[PDB]
Scaffold this active site. Structure first.
Site, short mmCIF file in Angstrom:
data_model
loop_
_atom_site.label_atom_id
_atom_site.label_comp_id
_atom_site.label_asym_id
_atom_site.label_seq_id
_atom_site.Cartn_x
_atom_site.Cartn_y
_atom_site.Cartn_z
NE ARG A 108 35.96 -38.88 -0.49
CZ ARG A 108 36.57 -39.95 -0.74
NH1 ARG A 108 36.76 -40.23 -1.89
NH2 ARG A 108 37.23 -40.32 0.34
CE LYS A 166 35.46 -43.85 -5.06
NZ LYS A 166 34.09 -43.77 -4.43
#
Ligand SMILES: Nc1nc2c(c(=O)[nH]1)N=C(CNc1ccc(S(=O)(=O)Nc3nccs3)cc1)CN2
Ligand SMILES: Nc1nc2c(c(=O)[nH]1)N=C(CNc1ccc(S(=O)(=O)Nc3nccs3)cc1)CN2
Lengths: 267, 267
Positions: free
Chosen positions: A247, A213
């Site tokens: 995840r 991210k």
């Protein structure tokens, strides 16, 4: 610690033995080439230690292009049927829509993964209730004006539990997610990581989604493809601060880190 | 948090701004080829984010072959003089001997790194006192029959402080190390990691040395060359549990992880 296992259909996932790896599968152009690529990627991720496979697309990813209702169905459904048969692992469908979520389970998906935690379409939580399937509720909002980040996140998350429980969703199907990278400045993203252990007072398993991210990018000054080490640091802190699932894109590397964290912390 | 910086000679190392990376340099056959290889490796490790360079050998590594007094000198000294001039970073000499340690500083080494914490040759701590140079005291023992691991490690470490302080070593030159992989079953190694924050009550900076060590191998069932991810998990826990320095082989990868940990924990 957890007095129950995560029951889904054919497979039982144990919450005390190890950190569960959820591998990411991106599906963005039902032709042969896309469905075959998706299957090969899932086999790979299975062989590298993934416990769950996650199937989503262009909605729910920056862009957030509001693609069509019937469109999501014909893209994601063939994907599920194929992965379900070739790959002996539970599947989650990454959608914020009841309509889509509905088909997904019927086509063989096991877990629901809602980046809007039932606030987009509260009807999704009814779908959850009815097939009796774990649902992940992520923190998100349509603004990011926090009085107080953690307090507001816990309040927001609790607003999601309320929608699910009222639908009939049993506690043992709820799973929460702090929604890293959603409605959060990069500094807020760091604060949330720093205080992740606060989500534990709510009494539900937590899943963390920080793979590659951009807040990792903001800190390290590095593009998406050089974010593996920085993703690693976020997975380690998360496990240490109590998360049950992570995840990730890099199933191999993260799986080794998680297994070394588990041994150190005593999991 | 720390009211002082780590003063050595030409360079000042700040203990509050970031986790300090110490890069590992192994020197095991004064010919041109060895000294040039060592220099090139140090330049590499500098370019990848190393803050200190660590220079040792075949004694102090499993094997622990008791090689000769005058032998250690002629191997390690040319190494230091060359690295010191080409590479603008502080250097530590990995030895348990006063004699050797002595030459090393005179040849330009800055920090002393004793895997025996002054119990091998208590005279080393006098060398430390005299040139006024940070000394790292590692937990180690010649047996591994613990009544209680952490309590015994803190007691043992304190036995080292006592030897140093009595020699004249100022507090602000002491640095401790839990001695991972030394006199410790693999389970004991895991316990020590799990309780690393206990060393903090002693009031001295802590350095962690877990790079590619075999307890990582024991957990992951993986040989030395596949231990990078598992080393990463140990570096992350360490930083989170309060360590100031980490000793590593993979300077590039660890440096990214440490910098992401620092941002998350608030360092
Ligand atoms: N449970 C759960 N499900 C998820 C999650 C998640 O965290 N948890 N994240 C995404 C992916 N969305 C996303 C990817 C990257 C970023 S970002 O922080 O890197 N920002 C940007 N990425 C690209 C342009 S701006 C933000 C959201 C999809 N599904
Ligand atoms: N401050 C500080 N200085 C050090 C350190 C350290 O941890 N801290 N470790 C070594 C390296 N020694 C070592 C390497 C590997 C292992 S092991 O756990 O992997 N065991 C074995 N390695 C090879 C055969 S058995 C044990 C000690 C040298 N100098």
């Amino acid at each position: 610690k957890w007095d129950y296992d995560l029951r889904c259909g054919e497979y039982t996932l144990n919450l005390n033995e190890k950190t569960l790896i959820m591998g990411i599968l991106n599906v963005t152009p039902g032709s042969y080439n896309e469905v075959d690529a998706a299957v090969r990627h899932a086999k790979e991720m299975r062989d590298e230690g993934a416990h769950i496979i996650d199937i989503g697309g262009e909605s729910t990813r920056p862009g957030f292009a509001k693609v069509s209702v019937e469109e999501e169905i014909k893209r994601v459904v063939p994907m599920i049927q194929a992965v379900s048969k070739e790959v002996k692992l539970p599947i989650s469908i990454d959608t914020y829509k009841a309509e889509v979520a509905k088909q997904a389970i019927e086509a063989g998906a096991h877990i629901i993964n809602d980046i809007w935690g039932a606030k987009a379409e509260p009807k999704i939580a009814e779908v959850a209730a009815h097939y009796d399937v774990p649902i992940i509720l992520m923190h998100n909002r349509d603004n990011m004006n926090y009085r107080n980040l953690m307090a507001d996140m816990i309040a927001d998350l609790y607003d999601s539990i309320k929608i699910a429980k009222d639908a009939g969703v049993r506690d043992e199907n709820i799973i929460l997610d702090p929604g890293i990278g959603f409605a959060k400045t990069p500094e807020q993203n760091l604060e949330a990581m720093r205080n992740l252990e606060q989500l534990n007072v709510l009494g539900y398993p937590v899943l963390l989604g920080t793979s590659r991210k951009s807040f990792i990018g903001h800190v390290l000054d590095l593009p998406v493809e050089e974010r593996l080490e920085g993703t690693g640091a976020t997975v380690c802190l998360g496990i240490e601060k109590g998360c049950e699932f992570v995840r990730v894109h890099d199933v191999k590397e993260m799986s080794r880190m998680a297994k070394m964290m588990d041994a150190m912390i005593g999991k």
